[PDB]
Amino acid sequence: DPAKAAFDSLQASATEMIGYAWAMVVVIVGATIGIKLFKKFTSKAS
Amino acid sequence: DPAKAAFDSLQASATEMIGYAWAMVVVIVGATIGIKLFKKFTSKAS
Amino acid sequence: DPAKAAFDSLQASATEMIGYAWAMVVVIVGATIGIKLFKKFTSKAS
Amino acid sequence: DPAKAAFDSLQASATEMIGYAWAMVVVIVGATIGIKLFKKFTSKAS
Amino acid sequence: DPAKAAFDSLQASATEMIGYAWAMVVVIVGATIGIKLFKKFTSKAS
Amino acid sequence: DPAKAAFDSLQASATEMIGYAWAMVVVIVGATIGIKLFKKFTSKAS
Amino acid sequence: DPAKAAFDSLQASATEMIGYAWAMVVVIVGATIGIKLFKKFTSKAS
Amino acid sequence: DPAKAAFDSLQASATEMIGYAWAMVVVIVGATIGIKLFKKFTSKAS
Amino acid sequence: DPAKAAFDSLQASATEMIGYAWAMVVVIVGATIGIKLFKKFTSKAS
Amino acid sequence: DPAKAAFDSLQASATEMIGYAWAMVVVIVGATIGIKLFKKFTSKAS
Amino acid sequence: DPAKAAFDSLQASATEMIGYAWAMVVVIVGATIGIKLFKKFTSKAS
Amino acid sequence: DPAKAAFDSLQASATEMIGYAWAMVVVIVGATIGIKLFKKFTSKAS
Amino acid sequence: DPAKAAFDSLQASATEMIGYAWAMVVVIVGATIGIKLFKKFTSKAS
Amino acid sequence: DPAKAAFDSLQASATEMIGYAWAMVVVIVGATIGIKLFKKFTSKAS
Amino acid sequence: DPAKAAFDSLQASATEMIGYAWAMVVVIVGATIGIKLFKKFTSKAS
């Protein structure tokens, strides 16, 4: 069955991209939250 | 009746593909919603 | 009348095929609408 | 009538999904409002 | 006139399906608007 | 002239069918537009 | 002219729905503004 | 020339329908913009 | 040559119809684009 | 060339609508900014 | 070769229309972006 | 029977072409879906 | 063999037309994509 | 077998075009995401 | 190969537009951030 194999391959490609997307999100969000806390704690400290 | 058998076969093939489609959708949607909640809760928490 | 009998048989065959077609349509459309609602409600819920 | 039965089934499936969506919404919103009040009352108390 | 009768029947079938479609729309839209208001009022209340 | 009469009859039959077609179109289009506006205004109102 | 009548009916249906939409908007907006002022004046008063 | 007359009639019918379409658009758009401004000014005023 | 004359006449008739077709297109397209811009600018303005 | 004339007319219609849109924007924005400054200066003055 | 000449003419007509299309786009987009910036800067300024 | 052999050969040729068609489809669809997901996940990630 | 020569000539004519078709496609598609990107980047930039 | 060779060639051409498409996508998406992050980080930084 | 050349040209056009878009963004963002800092520092200074 040609269809069975095809869908398997598609689903594997998708799984890989999702992997790459998670990596990126973690970097960008890391920095957004980083800057937010730096602004907040500096104010409270002083 | 040749037609009866033919339609049966077609309907079985279709049933199988629908199976494969559901698998894929669950993966892709899983990740979309995953990233959305991660962005949202991280913000509220901080 | 040979013609009368012939048309009757043709009309019966057609009636049967229409039956098989309805079965198939209900399956395919079932899945199309299924996936559409799953995508829509998941988004609104989150 | 094939159509009557078909629409009934579709409408039942939809009713079930709506059920699942309400469950999810209640969890997510529960937490959003939870965190908001915790932040607010802690501040006023101190 | 065979045509007159035929068109009458078609138009009756269509009228019935439109009936079933209205039922479905009312359910789906009911839930979409329901969730939207629940999200909105909960926020304003808190 | 046999032809003159024949064409007259054909043209009358056609005129009648066009009549029946207009009736049907008005029903189907009525519902399509109906549902579209219901979806649109409900959203804006809420 | 079948078209003239058809458009008239469509335009009447639309006019009615707009009526129902205005009713809903007035209720929802009434409450949103109500809560906003209650929050604001209570604070200033105390 | 049969064609000349025919095209003239078609073009007149089209001109009339365009007339009816403009009437409808003005009503629907009138209400959409109406509701949008009511929501916006009420908020700013309060 | 009978053929030469015949083709000339055909080609003239065609040229005339193309003329009538251009007139119609300009009217219909005029209105389609008209309504599209009215919808678009009204939204942006408000 | 039928096309040249057609595009000219379309472009003139568009130019006119843009004119009407600018008029509206100036009114709405005038009021939004008006209310904003009234709220701001009254507070600072008192 | 009749074909060579024909394609040349078609390609020239197309080139001219593309010219007219660019003119229109520049006008419409000019205004869309114009209104967007006016709304944005007025807000920031005040 | 010359006919029996002939139909067998035709049916074999067809079976082979279907094979080649499946190969091509899998490549083209692979890329279409690939690009679609790349566009979608990149947006959500950022 | 008269047939051999004939097919050769036909195949040459076809090859030439395909050449002219490619030229045209490149112009039309050039403009379609051009306008699409102009609309997209102008929006993002502003 | 003429068909076998033909399909092979088609599939090779397609493979090459897909190559060129990927190149273009990477450029366009590169810039879209670039501008988005520049807008976002500049705001948070200031 | 006509396709190879075509894609090259498209990709060059795109590269140029991206250039123009970056220029615009730098101007608009320059001013937005400019005004924001002027408002902020003036307040803190006084």
Author numbering:
A (entry chain BBB), B (entry chain BaB), C (entry chain BbB), D (entry chain AAA), E (entry chain AaA), F (entry chain AbA), ...: 5 to 50
What does the paper say about this structure?
Most extensively studied in this group are the F-specific filamentous phages (Ffs) that include viruses f1, fd and M13.
pVIII forms the main body of the filamentous phage. It is produced initially with a signal sequence that is cleaved to leave a single α-helix of 50 residues in length, with thousands of these helices packing together in a helical array to coat the length of the phage DNA genome. The α-helices are slightly curved; with their C-termini projecting into the phage lumen, resulting in an overall highly positive charge. The N-terminus of pVIII is splayed outwards towards the exterior of the capsid. In our map, density is smeared for the four N-terminal residues, indicating that these are flexible. The helical parameters were determined using cryoSPARC and were refined to a helical twist of 37.44° and a helical rise of 16.6 Å. In the filamentous section, pVIII interacts with its neighbours by mainly hydrophobic interactions, with hydrogen bonds observed at the C-termini and mostly involving lysine residues. Four lysine residues from each pVIII monomer (Lys 40, 43, 44 and 48) line the DNA cavity.
